[PDB]
Amino acid sequence: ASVHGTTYELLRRQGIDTVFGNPGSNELPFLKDFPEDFRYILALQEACVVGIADGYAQASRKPAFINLHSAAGTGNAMGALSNAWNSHSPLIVTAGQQTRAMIGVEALLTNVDAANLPRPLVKWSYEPASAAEVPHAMSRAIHMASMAPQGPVYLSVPYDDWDKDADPQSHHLFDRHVSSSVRLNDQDLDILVKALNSASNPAIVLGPDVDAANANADCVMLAERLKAPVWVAPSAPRCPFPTRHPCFRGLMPAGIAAISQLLEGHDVVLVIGAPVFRYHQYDPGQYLKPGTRLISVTCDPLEAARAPMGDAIVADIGAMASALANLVEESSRQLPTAAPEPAKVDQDAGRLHPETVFDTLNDMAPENAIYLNESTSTTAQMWQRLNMRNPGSYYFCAAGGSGFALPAAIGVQLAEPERQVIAVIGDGSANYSISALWTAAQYNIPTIFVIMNNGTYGALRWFAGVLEAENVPGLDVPGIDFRALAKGYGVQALKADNLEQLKGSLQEALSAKGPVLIEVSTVSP
Amino acid sequence: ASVHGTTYELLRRQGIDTVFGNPGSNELPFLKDFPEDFRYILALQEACVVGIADGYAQASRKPAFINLHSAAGTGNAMGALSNAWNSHSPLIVTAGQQTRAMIGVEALLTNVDAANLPRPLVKWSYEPASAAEVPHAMSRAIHMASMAPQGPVYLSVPYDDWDKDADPQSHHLFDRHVSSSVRLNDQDLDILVKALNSASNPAIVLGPDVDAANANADCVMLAERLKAPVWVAPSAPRCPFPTRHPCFRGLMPAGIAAISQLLEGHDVVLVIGAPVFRYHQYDPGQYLKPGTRLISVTCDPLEAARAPMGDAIVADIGAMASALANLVEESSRQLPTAAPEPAKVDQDAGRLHPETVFDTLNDMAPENAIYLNESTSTTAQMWQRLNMRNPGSYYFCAAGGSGFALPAAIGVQLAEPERQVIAVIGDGSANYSISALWTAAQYNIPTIFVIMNNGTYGALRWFAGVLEAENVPGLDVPGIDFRALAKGYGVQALKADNLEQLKGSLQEALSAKGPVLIEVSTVSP
Amino acid sequence: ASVHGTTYELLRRQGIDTVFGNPGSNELPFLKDFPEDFRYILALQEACVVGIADGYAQASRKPAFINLHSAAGTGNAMGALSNAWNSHSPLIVTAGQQTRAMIGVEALLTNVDAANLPRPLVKWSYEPASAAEVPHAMSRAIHMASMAPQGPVYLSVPYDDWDKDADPQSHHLFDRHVSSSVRLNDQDLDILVKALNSASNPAIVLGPDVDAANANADCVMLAERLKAPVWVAPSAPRCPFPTRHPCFRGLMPAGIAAISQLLEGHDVVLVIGAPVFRYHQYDPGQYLKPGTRLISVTCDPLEAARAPMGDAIVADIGAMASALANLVEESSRQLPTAAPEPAKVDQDAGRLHPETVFDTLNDMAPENAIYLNESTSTTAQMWQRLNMRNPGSYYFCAAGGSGFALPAAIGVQLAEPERQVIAVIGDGSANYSISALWTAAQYNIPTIFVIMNNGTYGALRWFAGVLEAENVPGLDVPGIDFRALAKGYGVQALKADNLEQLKGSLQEALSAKGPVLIEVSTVSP
């Protein structure tokens, strides 16, 4: 067998059947004779390729496979890899290298010092020392991406390797099963359960690894037994809990002092599946107030090590959430009362308040919709106004890098063909990965893109007002016609300048048979 | 003085007056109180920011200054940095970091292990250990980018540093002059000149560092004295010689055997300002034929070290080209005869042959036009058909990474406001950095963009036919309306489906007062 | 509080009370006012410092703390770090940096690009962005070294940081408890137990992480229940099983074909706490024979990913070994029969055969002796001839790097003051870290060093005969007087030229009150 045949056999035996890619010449010997049982999803720029694959991996809860062109293609994808690193996304990034005979002379398209290029944003990065090693290196890539804490990996392959003979012993790779589905030992788990059972006023904080593990329902059971309020850890990349459940208390503010104040009076705070904590604004104060202790369950040693407070347990979130939910006592305390509905903001017949947009989406969207957020100044309102009952209902760029939601919404829609995906993206953010629209058109992936057009980088302008920073350049983005961009890439486009038109556009988009972009005129901040 | 005030003083004292950027919150404390004597050029995605800055630096022959947002912004620019590394472009890339007080906890927007992120595509990469060190680190960045061999550098700055007090001794940085304008010592230069004077059939090969040095006219004098044919080294990022001069012999094929055959019978081959050589296709054979010896003058130790043949001299290209041109004897050999004009290809009233497009551009464009090439299957025809008399008339992505020409053409047009820039870009390549169009519209930078629309990644399809590689996916890019994309970003757009319409569109574009995009329907390969 | 006071408080609160070091000026502000409750162990060269700390950490089963001088001191220790990486040794390596005000100018003793220096041989490597961050960075170092898979970490600290004010919120670091004591979830553990219970002819292979976990007794119970033979995985850094237990089958040969042949006929092979596998010689063949399947339990994702065959479970070895031992059925198969005693090799009145040396050590040493091996050509005989009943009885350089055993034997003796340590070291290997002897003399650490003097690098000469490699230079090491080296560093020294003198020397060494070196004249290979 060839390296090509053996590698595709390994991929299919490990559950991989789709290649997300933007091709180049170093990749042609890999992509030739493409297997009939695989799909290739083309995107027009590599940030788009990786974003699509990332949404697909996060929604599918399985690794996604990517093929990029040498250094330039890898490099164009590194902002997308920064988000994937923070979301623990299991991405297998492969890039073609020059033929081994011209690497030394640094022929055009040689990826020099290849494994160092995507560092520090990958868990493992490698170029094999020989063609026969390629299937084994691919096996390592698959398992490194997939083991907890999941994350992106990188493999560079010289193009001449694919046609070489494989090692006949590579068959031992095909059916390897590697598990990291582990939980704290019985004695120490009993100690933790007793601490939870004994708490007078526990609180629960959940992060994105809960939703990645599909541990959401177990965390609902845990919160109901402990009769505990539940937040979402700050800068949230996913939604780990039903947002109208009576225990739910919303998205935590991303500040040190704000969080310790929020937790004041809670004697034990159990954090599951989050860094402690992804603060953002600088809001100095106490990490925790006197009387509060914190216990973190994380799948990532790096998170456990860097927490500035609390105890930690490094284990699989699915296994731990299930064990805790099934072991804790039912507290005799009263179940927390649900948060009240958000108020309706006054809305005239002109430009839309973001609050109006979210209320209308909540009214019209199916109950199993999936939302993506890259409307950076409206996140708080989004979290208050969308009832997200189900797992896998929310994604936000985990490293804060714009350019994620537009392509990721296409990958999520590919992963979840029966759940309507609605990406809510600011006019600024929409540009970073605008060409991803073409993939939705070409493959007829029926994502709805809602562009919140307020003419400016609103979150930045707000923070500049917050610093009394005058004379900051580059904050306005006038003069972009998003319906024309959509037409450019073959996506149906609608405009909503007021509420009547927003409702009409959403009705038209929800009944369409393909992707739709709606440009919404929103109120300037 | 503050670190902010001292750093902008250093920049202006070192000749920097423009910031190319896409802003974020870690950068607001740098950009606030932006000096009135500086310009900020916004682009909508970081590959675009860096591409614009790169074209500006290459055309201006001076460093360009860039400001990007943390890891995600840096990462989005790394494909652009791969081209800048290969073109020796002097780019000072700065990125904002989190405040020093929250780097440890890895708050959102922390750039983890920052200096390793752009490696291996930068000459120097650094984050200062304290705020007071920032001006000195900026000084290092300026000089590292600017010294031969020029190239991109990276500086990460925690946002809280800018408001801190500067070291009063930083004033010694402001007027430092650092020179690498050096040439081979007299004794060894005399030996080289004698070898050139004695050659029976010399040949000259020129690379991009000639055009970067503005050594073009000196190389014309050198070739006229030696009565020697002149090529352009393969995979050429720039044009180092007038393409209708009688000595000119065109772009070398990017293959080992092809080049040694081309050079057969030449006893001494002098290469100036190029790697030896940027081969591309694998075309194995002799590096040089018996009877040919090679001497390379390069500004880059890495090029001298990796050449598989020949002697080398590591020195400044401007200084060496001037010295050689003025020292060699006038040979009594006959001056080479000019290459004949290219033939006219038969053209019907339908879709355009690329040859027709280049002939028409050559007929209509001003004699001091500047061309950019990202039409990957038509490069040979472009080089045969455009008379480029002047320095700084041609740019092509030096690492082969698409996404360079569209933004770089805007930066070149900014650098050369009196020379009409015409970017010739394939329909595939146009997407990588499509949002750069907005910058041309906003700042009214009058670049002309000629999109060669043949519906496919033609160079890739050709190479797949060359390998008899069947069943390669992802090679076609149907369904893109480039006039709508242009309208989306505010650029006037025209379509040319035949020759009459091409001539009309070019006449309209050449007389326009702003940027123009022309979508040309070209013949499918 | 100062950074100095806060950091020592964190160290003591996390169980650290000893600093292994070789001091320099960047370290004086850390070491000044050294706390009265800490000990400082000086060694004369940094390979020695780290080797001592490594033996201490491995024998104590807890992290050891090291302080080295800048780049040169760190660099002198990197061969020792290569061994520590392979043995999963929890080492906290700190190095002093220049004052932040002179890092930029690269003053003498600046550690440039410090965090990259020990890569790729550390789990985490860091220099803090400010003085107040130092305690938090130290906390990260402590936990990263200590979490599974344990390993060395690196922290660089500018010398001016220690006297600065600490952040008052650093107190939250002091009592953090971080656990990785995890095991496979119940459902999948039940599946594994059923597979073991059902096996017709199981085999067990144990690696060093068993001994690190003190899982040895649980593995004895497991092997007795399964009635299974037990090997030791190849290139063994530790001894994980009593070597005279009836199930024990010895050290596996470090070859692919040899191991698959050894395992032939075993239907299920359970590997615990080892890479799969640390082969050495190139012995190509089948990884496993038909009929054998392999299941690996490892604490290290990198081991699980790179195994070329088998299933894997990534979990804590202590927790998994205990769970398996207590869950499997008692098989009705007959318990394996003990291996026969080794034969006595014929020995005349001249130079000693290594077999004689090991038999005599086994006869004379206490039953709770601890052995170290750096006598590279005699490893097989050592494993056959020493009865090691207890955990923590054997250490061998895990990456194959000589220079480990001499210093590590001092650290092990410090960790285990009531167990006599006997290091058996070849004459070649003894030189790499010879100055470590001084530490044993100064602190009166009563290690016994047995130098096997055969005049040559015997393992290398053997492998050169194996390749029929003629004319290899550098294989002989004549002319070293080890008694004089011992006297040089203050250690009592004895010589044994024959068996009578070996017995007399060992009797004298075993009754001595301090360290003793015995130079043994062994037979040339």
Ligand SMILES: Cc1ncc(Cn2c(C)c(CCOP(=O)(O)OP(=O)(O)O)sc2=O)c(N)n1
């Ligand atoms: C790749 C990248 N570049 C730059 C930024 C900086 N940035 C930018 C430019 C934001 C503005 C987003 O504007 P928007 O139109 O999408 O939304 P709002 O108007 O609601 O802020 S938010 C933010 O963090 C970024 N996060 N990611």
Ligand SMILES: Cc1ncc(Cn2c(C)c(CCOP(=O)(O)OP(=O)(O)O)sc2=O)c(N)n1
């Ligand atoms: C960033 C990036 N991604 C992918 C490629 C691979 N690639 C691609 C995709 C080419 C096709 C360009 O298509 P085009 O329409 O611009 O021109 P032609 O049809 O004349 O080839 S040429 C080439 O090397 C690349 N060079 N750079």
Ligand SMILES: Cc1ncc(Cn2c(C)c(CCOP(=O)(O)OP(=O)(O)O)sc2=O)c(N)n1
């Ligand atoms: C730091 C280092 N340098 C070089 C070697 C190479 N090497 C050397 C030089 C060996 C010879 C050891 O000689 P010895 O006297 O200690 O033992 P034998 O005579 O029993 O081989 S074994 C081996 O792998 C090494 N392992 N480690």
Ligand SMILES: [Ca+2]
């Ligand atoms: Ca099919």
Ligand SMILES: [Ca+2]
């Ligand atoms: Ca906006």
Ligand SMILES: [Ca+2]
């Ligand atoms: Ca001005």
Ligand SMILES: [Ca+2]
């Ligand atoms: Ca094309």
Ligand SMILES: [Ca+2]
């Ligand atoms: Ca004391």
Ligand SMILES: [Ca+2]
């Ligand atoms: Ca020896």
Ligand code: NA
């Ligand atoms: Na990198």
